[PDB]
Amino acid sequence: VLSEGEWQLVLHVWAKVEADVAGHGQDILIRLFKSHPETLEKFDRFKHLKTEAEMKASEDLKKHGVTVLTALGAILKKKGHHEAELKPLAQSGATKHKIPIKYLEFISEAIIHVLHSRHPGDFGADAQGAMNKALELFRKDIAAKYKELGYQ
Numbered sequence: 001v002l003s004e005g006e007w008q009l010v011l012h013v014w015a016k017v018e019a020d021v022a023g024h025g026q027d028i029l030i031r032l033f034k035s036h037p038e039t040l041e042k043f044d045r046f047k048h049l050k051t052e053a054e055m056k057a058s059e060d061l062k063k064h065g066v067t068v069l070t071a072l073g074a075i076l077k078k079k080g081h082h083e084a085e086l087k088p089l090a091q092s093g094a095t096k097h098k099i100p101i102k103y104l105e106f107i108s109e110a111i112i113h114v115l116h117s118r119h120p121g122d123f124g125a126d127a128q129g130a131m132n133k134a135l136e137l138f139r140k141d142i143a144a145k146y147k148e149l150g151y152q
Protein backbone atom coordinates (compact mmCIF):
# COMPACT_ATOMS: atom_id res chain seq x y z
CA VAL A 1 0.00 0.00 0.00
CA LEU A 2 1.13 3.57 -0.90
CA SER A 3 0.25 6.64 1.13
CA GLU A 4 -1.78 9.39 -0.51
CA GLY A 5 1.18 11.70 -0.53
CA GLU A 6 3.13 9.01 -2.33
CA TRP A 7 0.56 8.51 -4.97
CA GLN A 8 0.77 12.15 -5.70
CA LEU A 9 4.47 12.22 -6.40
CA VAL A 10 3.90 9.28 -8.72
CA LEU A 11 1.23 11.13 -10.41
CA HIS A 12 3.05 14.43 -10.33
CA VAL A 13 5.80 12.71 -12.16
CA TRP A 14 3.52 10.80 -14.66
CA ALA A 15 2.18 14.16 -15.88
CA LYS A 16 5.66 14.93 -17.29
CA VAL A 17 5.85 11.62 -19.05
CA GLU A 18 2.48 12.33 -20.48
CA ALA A 19 3.77 15.39 -22.28
CA ASP A 20 5.94 13.14 -24.56
CA VAL A 21 4.70 9.55 -24.30
CA ALA A 22 6.31 8.45 -27.44
CA GLY A 23 9.63 9.87 -26.46
CA HIS A 24 9.56 8.42 -23.05
CA GLY A 25 8.41 5.33 -24.62
CA GLN A 26 11.31 4.74 -26.92
CA ASP A 27 14.00 5.62 -24.33
CA ILE A 28 12.46 3.11 -22.02
CA LEU A 29 12.52 0.32 -24.35
CA ILE A 30 15.86 1.04 -25.80
CA ARG A 31 17.35 1.17 -22.45
CA LEU A 32 15.79 -2.19 -21.60
CA PHE A 33 16.96 -3.86 -24.72
CA LYS A 34 20.32 -2.31 -24.30
CA SER A 35 20.77 -3.28 -20.75
CA HIS A 36 19.23 -6.79 -20.93
CA PRO A 37 19.35 -7.94 -24.42
CA GLU A 38 17.84 -11.34 -23.75
CA THR A 39 14.60 -9.40 -23.38
CA LEU A 40 14.89 -8.52 -27.02
CA GLU A 41 14.18 -12.24 -27.72
CA LYS A 42 10.50 -11.87 -26.80
CA PHE A 43 10.10 -9.58 -29.70
CA ASP A 44 10.24 -11.14 -33.13
CA ARG A 45 9.29 -7.86 -34.58
CA PHE A 46 12.33 -5.95 -33.03
CA LYS A 47 15.11 -8.64 -33.12
CA HIS A 48 16.28 -7.35 -36.52
CA LEU A 49 17.05 -4.07 -34.81
CA LYS A 50 20.80 -3.82 -34.57
CA THR A 51 21.56 -0.27 -33.26
CA GLU A 52 20.20 2.49 -31.28
CA ALA A 53 19.72 4.52 -34.29
CA GLU A 54 17.86 1.93 -36.08
CA MET A 55 15.84 1.34 -32.94
CA LYS A 56 15.00 5.07 -32.77
CA ALA A 57 13.89 5.09 -36.35
CA SER A 58 11.54 2.20 -35.96
CA GLU A 59 7.96 3.22 -36.01
CA ASP A 60 6.78 -0.12 -34.68
CA LEU A 61 8.94 0.24 -31.66
CA LYS A 62 7.79 3.69 -30.98
CA LYS A 63 4.13 2.67 -31.34
CA HIS A 64 4.83 -0.18 -29.08
CA GLY A 65 6.43 2.18 -26.55
CA VAL A 66 3.13 4.32 -26.49
CA THR A 67 1.06 1.21 -25.92
CA VAL A 68 3.18 0.37 -22.92
CA LEU A 69 3.16 3.74 -21.19
CA THR A 70 -0.49 4.16 -21.97
CA ALA A 71 -1.34 0.90 -20.27
CA LEU A 72 1.00 1.50 -17.33
CA GLY A 73 -0.51 4.88 -16.95
CA ALA A 74 -3.99 3.71 -16.61
CA ILE A 75 -2.90 1.47 -13.81
CA LEU A 76 -0.98 4.05 -11.86
CA LYS A 77 -3.90 6.46 -11.79
CA LYS A 78 -6.05 3.81 -10.23
CA LYS A 79 -3.84 4.14 -7.19
CA GLY A 80 -3.85 0.56 -6.23
CA HIS A 81 -7.40 -0.16 -7.40
CA HIS A 82 -6.26 -1.69 -10.66
CA GLU A 83 -7.55 -5.28 -10.78
CA ALA A 84 -9.64 -4.87 -13.87
CA GLU A 85 -6.84 -3.21 -15.77
CA LEU A 86 -4.18 -5.50 -14.44
CA LYS A 87 -5.93 -8.72 -15.22
CA PRO A 88 -5.54 -8.59 -18.99
CA LEU A 89 -1.77 -8.09 -18.71
CA ALA A 90 -1.24 -11.00 -16.29
CA GLN A 91 -3.24 -13.13 -18.66
CA SER A 92 -1.30 -12.35 -21.82
CA GLY A 93 2.01 -12.58 -20.02
CA ALA A 94 1.08 -15.85 -18.38
CA THR A 95 -0.47 -17.33 -21.51
CA LYS A 96 0.89 -15.73 -24.71
CA HIS A 97 4.23 -14.00 -24.03
CA LYS A 98 5.55 -15.78 -20.94
CA ILE A 99 7.20 -12.84 -19.39
CA PRO A 100 8.99 -13.63 -16.32
CA ILE A 101 8.73 -11.44 -13.32
CA LYS A 102 12.44 -10.74 -13.69
CA TYR A 103 11.73 -9.26 -17.06
CA LEU A 104 9.32 -6.98 -15.18
CA GLU A 105 12.04 -5.93 -12.81
CA PHE A 106 14.30 -4.94 -15.65
CA ILE A 107 11.68 -2.85 -17.16
CA SER A 108 10.95 -1.23 -13.84
CA GLU A 109 14.55 -0.24 -13.72
CA ALA A 110 14.58 1.27 -17.20
CA ILE A 111 11.52 3.36 -16.18
CA ILE A 112 13.30 4.68 -13.28
CA HIS A 113 16.44 5.43 -15.12
CA VAL A 114 14.53 7.30 -17.91
CA LEU A 115 12.62 9.37 -15.44
CA HIS A 116 15.63 10.27 -13.56
CA SER A 117 17.48 11.31 -16.67
CA ARG A 118 14.72 13.45 -18.10
CA HIS A 119 13.21 14.96 -14.90
CA PRO A 120 15.92 15.27 -12.21
CA GLY A 121 14.21 18.23 -10.68
CA ASP A 122 10.89 16.43 -10.24
CA PHE A 123 12.41 13.05 -9.30
CA GLY A 124 14.38 13.27 -6.12
CA ALA A 125 14.65 10.57 -3.50
CA ASP A 126 11.16 10.98 -2.19
CA ALA A 127 9.42 10.72 -5.57
CA GLN A 128 11.79 8.06 -6.63
CA GLY A 129 10.97 5.92 -3.69
CA ALA A 130 7.34 6.44 -4.34
CA MET A 131 7.74 5.30 -7.98
CA ASN A 132 9.63 2.26 -6.88
CA LYS A 133 6.81 1.26 -4.54
CA ALA A 134 4.23 1.77 -7.20
CA LEU A 135 6.16 -0.30 -9.55
CA GLU A 136 6.56 -2.95 -6.88
CA LEU A 137 2.85 -3.11 -6.09
CA PHE A 138 2.21 -3.62 -9.85
CA ARG A 139 4.78 -6.46 -10.11
CA LYS A 140 3.44 -8.19 -6.93
CA ASP A 141 -0.12 -8.07 -8.21
CA ILE A 142 0.81 -9.43 -11.52
CA ALA A 143 2.92 -12.21 -9.92
CA ALA A 144 -0.08 -13.38 -7.93
CA LYS A 145 -2.37 -13.30 -11.01
CA TYR A 146 0.34 -15.27 -12.84
CA LYS A 147 0.27 -18.10 -10.23
CA GLU A 148 -3.50 -18.18 -10.31
CA LEU A 149 -3.23 -19.00 -13.98
CA GLY A 150 -0.71 -21.57 -13.62
CA TYR A 151 2.46 -19.61 -14.63
CA GLN A 152 4.19 -17.95 -11.61
Ligand code: HEM
Binding pocket: 039, 042, 043, 045, 067, 068, 069, 071, 072, 088, 089, 092, 093, 097, 099, 103, 104, 107
Ligand atom coordinates in the same frame (compact mmCIF):
# COMPACT_ATOMS: atom_id res chain seq x y z
C1 HEM B 1 5.37 -1.82 -17.52
C2 HEM B 1 5.18 -3.10 -17.82
C3 HEM B 1 4.51 -3.53 -19.14
C4 HEM B 1 3.34 -3.17 -19.60
C5 HEM B 1 2.27 -2.23 -19.08
C6 HEM B 1 3.14 -3.84 -20.81
C7 HEM B 1 2.03 -3.68 -21.58
C8 HEM B 1 1.89 -4.39 -22.74
C9 HEM B 1 0.72 -4.32 -23.56
C10 HEM B 1 -0.50 -3.41 -23.28
C11 HEM B 1 0.90 -5.09 -24.59
C12 HEM B 1 -0.14 -5.38 -25.69
C13 HEM B 1 -1.27 -6.37 -25.26
C14 HEM B 1 -0.75 -7.67 -24.72
O1 HEM B 1 -0.13 -8.38 -25.55
O2 HEM B 1 -0.81 -7.83 -23.46
C15 HEM B 1 2.17 -5.74 -24.47
C16 HEM B 1 2.51 -6.68 -25.37
C17 HEM B 1 3.62 -7.38 -25.22
N1 HEM B 1 4.51 -7.21 -24.20
FE1 HEM B 1 4.38 -6.03 -22.83
N2 HEM B 1 4.22 -4.67 -21.12
C18 HEM B 1 5.07 -4.52 -20.10
C19 HEM B 1 6.26 -5.18 -20.03
C20 HEM B 1 6.68 -6.08 -20.95
C21 HEM B 1 7.96 -6.78 -20.88
C22 HEM B 1 9.00 -6.48 -19.80
C23 HEM B 1 8.04 -7.59 -21.93
C24 HEM B 1 9.14 -8.54 -22.43
C25 HEM B 1 10.38 -8.43 -21.98
C26 HEM B 1 6.84 -7.46 -22.69
C27 HEM B 1 6.62 -8.28 -23.79
C28 HEM B 1 5.50 -8.15 -24.52
C29 HEM B 1 5.20 -8.81 -25.76
C30 HEM B 1 6.08 -9.87 -26.39
C31 HEM B 1 4.03 -8.37 -26.15
C32 HEM B 1 3.25 -8.60 -27.41
C33 HEM B 1 3.03 -7.31 -28.25
C34 HEM B 1 3.00 -7.45 -29.76
O3 HEM B 1 4.05 -7.91 -30.23
O4 HEM B 1 1.94 -7.15 -30.43
N3 HEM B 1 5.95 -6.53 -22.07
N4 HEM B 1 2.82 -5.28 -23.33
